[PDB]
Design a protein around this nucleic acid. Structure first.
Length: 88
RNA sequence: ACUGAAACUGUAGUAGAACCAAUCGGGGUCGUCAAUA
């Protein structure tokens, strides 16, 4: 059988357009949405921070509400029961 | 003379080891005070 495409198109999730409009021009705030999280491996013997395993990861602040546009290109003959299966 | 499809930048990793908020100190004890006329 030929490979089936998806019925569902899912966009990227972006911040609310008014919130992104507020960030325009504010490079300092644009960086401030994220902060450094440290990570370090500990030596299982000596119990000490294993140097050059010290690590900083950028993480984005919790509370973000992001939204993606979804398109369901369902088959036009699809049974109403099968619609409920997909929705389910 | 006709949009490829489909695919999680994820997986493992303790911001930690070491460092005394501490050193010294009797809750004690005796000579005046004042400057003019």
């Amino acid at each position: 059988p030929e490979p089936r495409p998806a019925l569902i198109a899912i966009g990227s999730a972006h911040l609310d357009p008014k919130l992104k409009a507020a960030f325009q021009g504010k490079k300092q705030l644009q960086e401030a949405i994220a902060f450094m999280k440290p990570g370090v491996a500990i030596d299982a013997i000596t119990g000490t921070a294993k140097k050059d395993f010290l690590r900083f990861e950028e993480v984005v602040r919790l509370g973000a509400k992001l939204t993606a546009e979804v398109e369901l290109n369902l088959p036009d003959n699809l049974s109403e029961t099968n619609k409920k299966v997909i929705a389910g």
